[PDB]
Amino acid sequence: SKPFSLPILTLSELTNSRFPVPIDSLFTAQNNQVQCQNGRCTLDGELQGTTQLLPTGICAFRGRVTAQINQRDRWHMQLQNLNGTTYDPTDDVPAPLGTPDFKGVVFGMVSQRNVGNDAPGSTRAQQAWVSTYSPQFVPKLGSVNLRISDNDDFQFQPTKFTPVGVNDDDDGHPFRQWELPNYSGELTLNMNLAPPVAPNFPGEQLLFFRSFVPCSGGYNQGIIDCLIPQEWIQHFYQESAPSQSDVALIRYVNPDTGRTLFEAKLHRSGYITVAHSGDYPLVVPANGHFRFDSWVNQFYSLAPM
Amino acid sequence: GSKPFSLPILTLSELTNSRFPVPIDSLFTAQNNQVQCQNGRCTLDGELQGTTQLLPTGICAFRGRVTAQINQRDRWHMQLQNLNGTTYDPTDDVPAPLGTPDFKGVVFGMVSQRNVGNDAPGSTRAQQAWVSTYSPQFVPKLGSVNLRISDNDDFQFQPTKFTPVGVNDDDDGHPFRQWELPNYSGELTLNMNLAPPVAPNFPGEQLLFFRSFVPCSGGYNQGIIDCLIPQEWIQHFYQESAPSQSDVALIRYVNPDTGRTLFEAKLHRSGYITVAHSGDYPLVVPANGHFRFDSWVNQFYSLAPM
Numbered sequence: 045s046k047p048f049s050l051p052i053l054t055l056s057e058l059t060n061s062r063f064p065v066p067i068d069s070l071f072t073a074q075n076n077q078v079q080c081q082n083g084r085c086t087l088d089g090e091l092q093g094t095t096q097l098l099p100t101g102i103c104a105f106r107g108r109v110t111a112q113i114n115q116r117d118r119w120h121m122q123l124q125n126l127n128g129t130t131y132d133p134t135d136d137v138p139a140p141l142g143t144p145d146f147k148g149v150v151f152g153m154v155s156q157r158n159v160g161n162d163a164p165g166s167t168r169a170q171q172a173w174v175s176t177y178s179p180q181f182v183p184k185l186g187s188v189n190l191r192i193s194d195n196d197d198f199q200f201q202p203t204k205f206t207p208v209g210v211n212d213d214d215d216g217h218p219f220r221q222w223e224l225p226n227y228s229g230e231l232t233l234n235m236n237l238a239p240p241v242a243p244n245f246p247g248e249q250l251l252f253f254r255s256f257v258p259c260s261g262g263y264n265q266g267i268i269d270c271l272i273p274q275e276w277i278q279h280f281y282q283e284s285a286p287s288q289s290d291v292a293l294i295r296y297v298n299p300d301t302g303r304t305l306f307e308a309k310l311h312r313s314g315y316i317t318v319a320h321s322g323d324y325p326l327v328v329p330a331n332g333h334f335r336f337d338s339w340v341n342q343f344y345s346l347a348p349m
Numbered sequence: 350g351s352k353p354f355s356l357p358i359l360t361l362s363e364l365t366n367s368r369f370p371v372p373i374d375s376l377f378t379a380q381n382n383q384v385q386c387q388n389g390r391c392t393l394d395g396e397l398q399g400t401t402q403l404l405p406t407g408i409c410a411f412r413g414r415v416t417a418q419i420n421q422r423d424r425w426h427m428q429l430q431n432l433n434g435t436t437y438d439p440t441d442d443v444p445a446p447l448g449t450p451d452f453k454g455v456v457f458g459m460v461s462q463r464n465v466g467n468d469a470p471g472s473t474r475a476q477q478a479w480v481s482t483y484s485p486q487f488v489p490k491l492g493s494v495n496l497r498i499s500d501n502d503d504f505q506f507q508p509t510k511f512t513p514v515g516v517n518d519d520d521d522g523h524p525f526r527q528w529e530l531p532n533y534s535g536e537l538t539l540n541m542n543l544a545p546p547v548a549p550n551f552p553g554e555q556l557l558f559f560r561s562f563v564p565c566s567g568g569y570n571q572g573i574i575d576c577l578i579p580q581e582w583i584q585h586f587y588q589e590s591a592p593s594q595s596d597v598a599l600i601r602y603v604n605p606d607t608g609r610t611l612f613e614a615k616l617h618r619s620g621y622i623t624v625a626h627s628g629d630y631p632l633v634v635p636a637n638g639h640f641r642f643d644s645w646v647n648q649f650y651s652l653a654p655m
């Protein structure tokens with residue numbers, strides 16, 4: 045059977061699977077619900093949730109603007125899949141792949157390029173925001189509404205949203221990275237979700253790949269934590285190596301010295317635990333990276349951090 | 350005992366342009382006319398060249414600190430760091446910090462800041478910005494570029510990131526020219542440490558590009574950015590580092606649904622593709638199609654006409 049492996053990449057050579065920026069650091073969290081939908085992939089290469097392969101697709105939208113309403117979330121964007129194919133709301137997914145998986149405001153830019161009868165080929169771009177609290181944030185149903193900076197220079201044309209960062213809303217709705225949006229809006233229940241993840245062995249905590257993403261005002265730290273980085277997902281999708289057990293023991297190595305700094309459990313469904321108690325930002329050498337060691341079971345006892 | 354060379358298995362819509370952070374839209378072969386892009390450059394055995402780095406989010410991005418303001422259109426002086434935040438060394442054997450744009454034009458996107466040190470550390474701001482690679486202050490090799498921004502009154506001398514969104518022509522006779530390299534050290538200085546120019550070296554052959562139509566911020570520009578190999582291939586070759594057994598790999602474009610080979614192409618050691626065709630031609634091929642490595646050939650191999 046095909047041997048399992050990780051790509052060999054340092055933290056600064058990794059992309060966050062939940063927001064399109066590099067990983068900054070590793071962090072282990074005290075146990076308190078973690079159920080992100082981007083950055084979800086099994087070790088044998090099955091994408092889950094809203095996970096797709098392109099880093100530039102994460103928290104992006106593609107579609108057409110078709111209407112406007114007299115509300116702050118003004119511009120109605122009918123979604124396509126990121127690859128431009130028609131979105132099917134009956135698909136067994138929580139929302140179009142790449143849809144943001146947190147409550148907050150995503151800021152970035154919208155761009156348009158006209159087709160058809162009105163000035164075909166004409167383009168425009170400007171700052172925009174997508175609130176995932178909005179009652180018009182209904183990506184599962186096939187649309188989201190945009191806030192934009194200049195309502196007078198925007199048309200009913202093919203549109204792309206390119207994310208840049210996140211924030212709390214200015215009306216006080218907070219950025220909550222672990223709270224899922226309502227993908228079909230008010231009074232609906234999310235479906236086809238990747239399951240929640242949590243440690244299942246005493247003394248263990250989740251380990252995250254952490255980024256501090258851009259914010260657009262105020263003091264928010266911009267923390268987005270992912271379970272496994274995008275390049276690992278891309279690798280597992282390519283390799284599709286059979287999982288020999290429920291846990292891949294992995295070692296964080298300093299390649300300059302050859303030493304193992306600590307060990308961790310990489311679970312079959314695509315998340316990591318370590319043996320530690322308390323919130324702890326790791327501060328480890330810049331050339332460090334994980335390597336696969338061996339297959340173990342759920343009850344393997346890790347060396348403490 | 351050579352490690353077998355391979356490509357990742359990815360359809361066009363599962364590929365990222367290595368010269369701008371967007372997906373590939375189509376394949377295009379061009380009539381012969383100089384092609385010397387610096388992003389998206391990697392040898393088949395995994396050696397990154399030019400200004401190529403590994404992350405799609407790094408392509409046409411900048412990171413550093415704004416340190417000065419000048420009274421000109423390109424107003425805000427951004428002292429660059431490497432994209433990973435480490436100190437940039439202008440004496441390194443690269444053309445410019447990795448990720449620097451490799452074309453003449455304007456890149457538009459957003460700048461964001463997050464303060465450090467004593468002055469309101471943790472405070473943030475973000476707004477639209479433009480970087481003109483025609484600017485005499487576009488001197489990334491020397492360690493800085495100047496930014497145009499939307500709101501000059503809300504911008505500080507603090508850590509800054511530029512996130513690209515699209516490209517455009519610049520104003521009054523400075524067009525977006527994807528095959529014209531900027532002067533990385535500014536006027537009157539020669540670019541150095543460049544990835545080499547690429548061209549077909551066999552009669553009847555043309556380059557094949559992975560083409561994207563990127564966003565533009567006004568006007569009618571098509572936003573065409575062509576790359577030699579997509580970012581995921583670069584990432585793959587960097588991981589694999591398979592020895593190249595000749596200067597030319599034969600690759601076939603296959604429809605996995607039918608198992609049929611649609612056409613063949615040469616994938617050259619320095620990381621670019623040629624096909625046997627005459628004339629500008631946008632390919633129209635099945636959505637599930639993808640290249641697979643067939644075998645190592647050589648310069649004398651005559652491709653079947655595309």
Ligand SMILES: C[C@@H]1O[C@@H](O[C@@H]2[C@@H](O)[C@@H](O)O[C@H](CO)[C@H]2O[C@@H]2O[C@H](CO)[C@H](O)[C@H](O)[C@H]2O)[C@@H](O)[C@H](O)[C@@H]1O
Binds near residue numbers: 214263473504
């Ligand atoms: C911390 C600041 O955040 C951003 O500015 C704030 C706006 O985003 C908005 O929320 O309103 C508040 C209050 O006016 C803004 O903060 C003030 O910003 C000014 C500068 O315009 C001063 O810095 C004040 O001290 C803030 O209270 C952002 O644009 C700004 O640059 C700051 O990072």
Ligand SMILES: C[C@@H]1O[C@@H](O[C@@H]2[C@@H](O)[C@@H](O)O[C@H](CO)[C@H]2O[C@@H]2O[C@H](CO)[C@H](O)[C@H](O)[C@H]2O)[C@@H](O)[C@H](O)[C@@H]1O
Binds near residue numbers: 166167169198566568
């Ligand atoms: C094609 C248009 O491109 C953008 O607007 C143009 C500006 O970017 C700039 O180049 O000046 C020209 C001419 O004034 C602008 O075109 C006019 O834009 C207005 C709307 O603001 C009308 O569309 C006119 O018909 C254009 O000539 C862009 O913002 C705009 O939406 C168009 O795509």
Ligand SMILES: [Mg+2]
Binds near residue numbers: 050051336
């Ligand atoms: Mg490994």
Ligand SMILES: [Mg+2]
Binds near residue numbers: 640
């Ligand atoms: Mg292959």
